[PDB]
Design a protein around this ligand. Structure first.
Ligand SMILES: CC(C)[C@H](N)C(=O)OP(=O)(O)O[C@@H]1O[C@@H](n2cnc3c(N)ncnc32)[C@H](O)[C@@H]1O
Ligand SMILES: Nc1ncnc2c1ncn2[C@@H]1O[C@H](CSCC[C@H](N)C(=O)O)[C@@H](O)[C@H]1O
Ligand SMILES: [Ca+2]
Ligand SMILES: [Ca+2]
Ligand SMILES: [Ca+2]
Ligand SMILES: [Cl-]
Ligand SMILES: [Cl-]
Ligand SMILES: [Cl-]
Lengths: 870, 64
C-alpha cells in the first residue's frame, strides 16, 4: 500500500471502536469507524459536485473535527486538499484561489449541508498511487506572490511511517497548529495512522496559557510546539507537561535553557528538536533530548529522519568534511514534487541528487550547517535574507514588493530587529517617490506660507527698511543680535551697489529692508509680494516721501506669476531670503525663468540667503546635539532623519543652479559663493549667494583654473605664497576644511570628521587682501566639511563664472521636498493599513520608518549599520 | 561566495529526469546518474527561459 486512505483503512480494520478524534470541548469524540463513515459521506458529496482524481479542493475552514473529516473525504475522493486560512484578508484568499484555480471551494457552510442522504461505504474511484498529490501548502515567495508546495502521498507516508512513531507516545496528540502550516501534517497523520487520537484544539490564535490548559486537561501525550511558543509555555507553565511523553519543538532555533526545564534524569518526557522546511515534508532532521546532559549550548538539529538524506555541501556541490561549514541539501523520499505553476523556480530549488537514487531529486534549503565532533548536524544560521517571525517563515521581498507598488514610495528595505524584550520583529525602511513638476500639495504649501505671513504682517508702525522683526538661533532658541542682522543685510546691499544697479525688481519685497537703502539712488524699484498686508503698509510708507513715490512700484502677486511685470526692462532681479518659502524645485525653476524674462540684456538674477543642501545634515546634527546633549549617536541620526523629512523650508544644493543654467543658453555666467563675514551663526555658516548673468555680460572664466589640494599639495599659508608664485597669481585651493563648521561643532558638541588644519573663509580673504589678491570662497562638491577658494589678482570686476566646480556625476538629490512633508508623516500609518488589508498579520511590519535616501556602502550595496533605530 | 544555482554570470545545463522533471545544473559539476542534458551550455537567463517554454506540464509522468 502507498496512499493515506489505504493505510488509514488498515487502522479502522483493527480498531473501529477506538477513539480517533476528540473535540475542543472534550464532550464529543468520534471513533475510527465513525470518522471513516463520516469521511466517506463527504467523499460521496464531493463526487456529486464533480470532484474526481487529481483535482484540487480548497478548504477555507477553521481548525475543527469537520476539517479532519473533510481532508479524509478529499483524499478518499482521489483529490488533493488545500487548506486556506479564513482569517486571512480577502485579497490574500482571492490571490491563492486564483493561483490554485481549484475544482471546488468548501468553507464553513459544509457543516450546514445534510450528509445523511449519501451512503457510508467506500467510493472506490480510480486507483491512486504514491506520486499523486495529497496536499498543497503556501510558503512566502521572494518575488511577491506566494508559492504552493505540491506534496504527495508517499511524501506524507515517508514522514508519517518513520519507525520513531511506532509506540504509545502519540496516543493522544494535540492538534493546534494552523492547517496552512505543515506541522498540521504531523499532528493529523501520526496519530491517525497508528491508532492514536487527534485532540483538536479550538479555532484561532492560542497563547501559551491557553495551550497549557488544553495540554493538561485533555490528557495530551504528544505535542508539536514552535520554538518561541515552547519557550514561553515551558517558563510559565512547566506543570502542564506532567503526562506528556514526547514534545517535538522546532521551527526556529530551540532554546537549550527551555529544554532543561522539562527534561530530567528519569526521562519520562523526551523533547525532540525537529528541523525541516516545507519542501521536505515537515521533518528532515531530529535531535532527541532524553536526559539533561544532551542539552548543549549549540542545540544541534541532529541526525536524519528515516526517509530523509542530509548533505552538507560546499559551493562546488561536493560533500564537506567533518567540522567544516556547508549549505544543507535534503535528499530522500520526503522531497516534494515542486512549486505549483512555477517550473523554473522548481528546477532552480528542487535539483538533481548526485548521492541518492538515479531519478531522485535534492532540495536546496539555503541553511548553513556543519557536522560536529560527535557526528550530529548543527544549524549555523542562514545564507539568504529569509527569517522567521513568531513561528512563520517570512521572505522580506514579499514585504518589499507590496510596499513598492503603492503610490508615494520608490524603494524599500525590510529587516528584522531584536527588541528590548527579546522577541524578533520586522521594520520596513522606505523612501518616498519624487515626481517632477510639483504635486497637488504644492499650491496648498504656498497658501500656508501666505496665511502665516499675512497674520504676521497684518496689524502688529515705523520707518522704511530699518526694522528686523526678530530672528532666533536654531542652536540656543535666543534672538540673533541686530548688529549681526544689520551686517547680513548690508552685505546684500553692498553687492547690489557693487553691480551698479539702476532698474531693480525685488521678488518678495517684504517690509522693505532692501527697498529702503537701494530705491533712493535707483532709476526704478519694483517690488512683488504675495502678502497683501505688506504691500498696503509699504504703499502707505512710500506715499509719505515724494522722492521715491514716482520711482517705486508695489504689486501684490506670487513669485510664480509674471502677469503685468515689465519684459526685458530691469538690469537686476533680487531674490533675497525668499526662495526658501517655495514648495519644490520646479517652482524655483519657473520663478527663475520668469525673473530671466524681466532682465534686459546684460542684467543678472541675485539669489541671496540660499539654504545649502550639502550641509543640511551637519546643520541639523548640530542643532539636535545642542538641544539634546545626552542623546546617543544612534538617537541623533534617528532624530536628524526625521528633521530632514519634516523640514518645511526649501533647501537647494549648488549643483541645481549649474544644472538649471545649462539648459538656458542666455545665462553666460553662474557665480556661486559663500556668505562673507566673521559672524558665527547659522545664516553665515550654511547659506550662500548665487548670481546669474545674461548673454552680453562677458565673465571671467574661473572653471578651468589650475588647482591644488589643501592637505596634500600645500600644507600651510607659507606654502600658499610659494604656490601662488609658481602658478603666477591664478590658483584655486581645494579640500579646505571649513572652520565655520568646526566652530559650529565644538559649540554644539558634535564629533564631526575632517582632516587637519581648517581655515576661516573670511580670514583667508583678509590674508589674500594683504598680499594683493581677491579670494572667492565657495562650497566643495567633494565634501560638506570642505570648501574651495579661487585666488586671483585683485580687481573690481563683479562678473565671474565657474567659481563653484562640480566633481563627478552627482544629480542624485539637488533639492528637498517640503510640500510633501505632511504626506511623509502619514506614510507609516497609511502603509500599515494598506499591508494589513492585503497580507497576513505576521507579514505586516511593526514599525515603518521613512528616509530621504537609503544609506549605501562605498561599493554600491545597502549599508545596514547606518539605518536608524526606532 | 554565492550559491552555484543563483550564479547569474555562470554556465549551466538543463537536465531532465526519467519522469521528465527538469533540473537546472552547473556545467563544472559531476552530472548525476539518471539525468540527461537537453539544453547545452548556456547562461542562467537563457537556461531559465528554456525551462518555462519546455516544462509546461509539471506532472511526473502519471498520466502525462
Ligand atoms: C515543522 C517544521 C519546523 C516546519 N516545516 C518549518 O518551520 O519549515 P519552514 O518552511 O517554515 O522553514 C524552515 O524554518 C527553519 N527551521 C526549521 N526548523 C528549525 C530548527 N529546529 N532550527 C533552526 N531553524 C529551523 C529552516 O531554516 C527552514 O527554512
Ligand atoms: N511664493 C511666494 N511668492 C511671493 N512672495 C513670497 C512667497 N513666499 C514668501 N514670500 C514673501 O517673501 C518675504 C520673505 S521675507 C524677506 C524679505 C526681503 N526679501 C529681505 O531680504 O529682507 C515675505 O515678505 C513673504 O511675503
Ligand atoms: Ca517515542
Ligand atoms: Ca507557526
Ligand atoms: Ca558683499
Ligand atoms: Cl457526525
Ligand atoms: Cl496528482
Ligand atoms: Cl508651512
Amino acid at each position: 500500500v502507498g496512499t493515506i486512505p489505504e493505510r488509514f483503512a488498515a487502522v479502522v480494520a483493527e480498531q473501529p471502536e477506538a477513539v480517533a478524534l476528540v473535540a475542543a470541548d472534550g464532550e464529543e469524540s468520534w471513533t475510527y469507524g465513525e470518522l471513516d463513515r463520516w469521511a466517506n459521506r463527504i467523499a460521496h458529496h464531493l463526487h456529486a459536485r464533480g470532484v474526481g482524481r487529481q483535482h484540487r479542493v480548497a478548504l477555507v475552514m477553521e481548525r475543527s473535527p469537520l476539517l479532519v473529516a473533510a481532508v479524509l473525504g478529499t483524499l478518499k475522493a482521489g483529490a488533493c486538499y488545500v487548506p486556506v486560512e479564513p482569517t486571512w484578508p480577502r485579497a490574500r484568499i482571492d490571490l491563492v484561489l486564483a493561483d490554485l484555480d481549484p475544482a471546488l471551494v468548501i468553507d464553513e457552510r459544509l457543516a450546514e449541508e445534510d450528509l445523511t442522504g449519501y451512503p457510508t461505504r467506500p467510493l472506490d474511484t480510480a486507483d491512486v498511487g504514491g506520486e499523486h498529490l495529497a496536499y498543497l501548502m503556501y510558503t512566502s515567495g521572494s518575488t511577491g506572490t506566494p508559492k504552493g508546495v505540491e506534496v504527495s502521498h508517499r511524501n506524507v507516508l515517508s514522514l508519517a511511517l518513520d519507525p520513531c512513531w511506532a509506540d504509545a507516545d502519540h496516543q493522544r496528540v494535540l492538534v493546534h497548529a494552523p492547517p496552512t502550516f505543515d506541522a498540521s501534517t504531523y499532528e493529523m497523520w501520526v496519530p491517525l495512522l497508528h491508532g492514536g487520537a487527534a485532540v483538536v484544539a479550538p479555532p484561532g490564535k492560542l497563547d501559551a496559557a491557553r495551550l497549557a490548559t488544553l495540554i493538561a486537561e485533555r490528557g495530551v501525550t504528544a505535542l508539536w510546539l514552535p520554538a518561541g511558543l515552547f519557550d514561553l509555555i515551558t517558563q510559565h507553565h512547566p506543570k502542564s507537561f506532567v503526562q506528556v511523553r514526547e514534545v517535538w519543538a522546532g521551527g526556529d532555533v530551540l532554546s537549550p535553557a527551555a529544554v532543561r526545564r522539562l527534561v530530567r534524569d528519569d526521562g519520562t518526557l523526551t523533547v525532540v528538536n525537529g528541523y525541516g522546511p516545507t519542501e521536505t515534508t515537515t521533518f528532515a532532521a531530529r535531535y532527541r533530548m532524553s536526559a539533561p546532559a544532551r542539552c548543549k549550548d549549540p542545540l544541534p538539529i541532529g541526525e536524519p529522519m528515516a526517509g530523509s538524506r542530509l548533505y552538507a555541501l560546499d559551493d562546488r556541490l561536493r560533500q564537506v568534511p567533518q567540522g567544516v561549514i556547508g549549505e544543507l541539501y535534503v535528499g530522500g523520499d520526503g522531497v516534494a514534487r515542486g512549486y505549483a505553476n512555477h517550473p523554473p523556480l522548481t528546477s532552480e530549488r528542487f535539483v538533481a541528487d548526485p548521492f541518492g537514487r538515479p531519478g531522485e531529486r535534492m532540495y536546496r534549503t539555503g541553511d548553513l550547517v556543519r557536522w560536529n565532533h560527535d557526528g550530529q548536524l548543527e544549524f549555523l544560521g542562514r545564507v539568504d535574507e529569509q527569517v522567521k517571525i513568531r513561528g512563520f517563515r517570512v521572505e522580506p521581498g514579499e514585504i518589499r514588493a507590496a510596499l513598492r507598488k503603492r503610490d508615494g514610495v520608490a524603494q524599500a528595505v525590510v529587516v528584522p530587529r531584536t527588541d528590548r524584550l527579546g522577541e524578533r520583529r520586522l521594520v520596513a525602511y522606505v523612501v518616498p517617490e519624487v515626481p517632477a513638476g510639483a504635486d497637488e500639495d504644492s499650491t496648498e504649501h504656498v497658501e500656508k506660507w501666505r496665511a502665516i505671513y499675512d497674520s504676521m504682517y497684518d496689524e502688529t508702525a515705523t520707518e522704511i527698511g530699518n526694522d528686523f522683526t526678530g530672528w532666533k538661533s536654531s542652536y540656543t532658541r535666543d534672538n540673533i543680535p541686530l548688529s549681526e542682522m544689520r551686517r547680513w543685510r548690508d552685505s546684500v546691499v553692498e553687492e547690489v551697489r557693487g553691480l551698479r544697479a539702476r532698474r531693480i525688481l525685488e521678488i518678495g519685497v517684504g517690509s522693505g529692508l532692501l527697498l529702503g537703502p537701494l530705491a533712493p539712488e535707483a532709476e526704478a524699484y519694483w517690488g512683488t509680494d504675495f502678502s497683501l498686508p505688506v504691500i498696503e503698509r509699504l504703499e502707505v510708507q512710500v506715499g509719505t516721501d515724494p522722492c521715491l513715490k514716482e520711482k517705486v512700484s508695489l504689486r501684490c502677486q506670487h513669485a510664480d506669476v509674471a502677469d503685468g511685470l515689465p519684459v526685458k526692462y530691469f538690469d537686476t532681479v533680487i531674490l533675497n531670503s525668499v526662495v526658501q518659502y517655495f514648495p519644490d524645485a520646479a517652482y524655483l525653476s519657473r520663478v527663475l525663468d520668469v525673473a530671466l524674462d524681466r532682465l534686459a540684456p546684460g542684467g543678472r538674477i541675485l539669489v541671496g540667503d540660499v539654504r545649502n543642501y550639502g550641509t543640511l545634515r551637519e546643520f541639523l546634527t548640530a542643532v539636535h546635539h545642542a538641544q539634546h546633549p545626552q542623546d546617543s549617536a544612534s538617537a541623533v541620526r534617528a532624530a536628524v532623519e526625521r528633521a530632514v523629512l519634516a523640514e518645511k523650508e526649501l533647501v537647494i544644493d549648488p549643483d541645481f543652479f549649474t544644472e538649471w543654467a545649462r539648459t538656458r543658453p542666455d545665462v553666460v555666467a553662474v557665480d556661486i559663493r559663500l556668505k562673507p563675514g566673521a559672524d558665527q551663526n547659522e545664516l553665515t555658516r550654511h547659506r550662500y549667494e548665487v548670481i546669474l548673468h545674461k548673454q552680453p555680460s562677458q565673465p571671467l572664466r574661473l572653471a578651468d583654473v589650475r588647482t591644488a589640494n589643501w592637505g596634500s599639495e600645500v600644507p600651510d599659508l607659507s606654502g600658499l605664497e610659494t604656490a601662488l608664485a609658481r602658478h603666477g597669481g591664478r590658483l584655486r585651493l581645494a579640500r579646505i576644511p571649513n572652520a565655520r563648521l568646526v566652530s559650529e561643532a565644538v559649540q554644539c558638541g558634535v564629533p564631526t570628521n575632517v582632516g587637519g588644519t581648517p581655515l576661516d573663509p573670511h580670514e583667508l580673504a583678509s590674508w589674500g587682501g594683504q598680499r594683493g589678491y581677491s579670494v572667492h570662497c565657495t562650497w566643495s562638491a567633494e565634501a560638506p566639511g570642505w570648501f574651495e577658494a579661487v585666488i586671483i589678482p585683485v580687481d573690481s570686476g563683479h562678473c565671474r563664472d565657474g567659481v563653484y566646480r562640480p566633481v563627478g556625476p552627482r544629480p542624485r538629490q539637488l533639492v528637498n521636498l517640503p510640500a510633501a512633508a505632511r504626506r511623509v508623516s502619514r506614510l507609516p500609518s497609511w502603509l500599515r493599513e494598506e499591508l494589513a488589508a492585503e497580507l497576513p498579520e505576521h507579514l505586516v511590519p511593526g514599525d515603518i520608518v521613512v528616509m530621504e535616501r537609503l544609506p549605501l556602502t562605498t561599493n554600491g550595496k545597502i549599508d545596514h549599520s547606518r539605518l536608524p533605530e526606532v | 561566495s554565492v550559491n552555484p544555482f543563483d550564479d547569474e554570470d555562470g554556465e549551466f545545463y538543463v537536465l531532465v529526469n526519467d519522469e521528465e522533471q527538469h533540473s537546472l545544473w552547473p556545467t563544472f559539476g559531476d552530472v548525476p546518474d539518471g539525468w540527461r542534458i537537453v539544453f547545452g551550455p548556456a547562461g542562467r537567463a537563457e537556461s531559465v527561459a528554456y525551462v518555462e517554454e519546455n516544462w509546461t506540464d509539471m506532472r511526473p509522468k502519471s498520466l502525462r
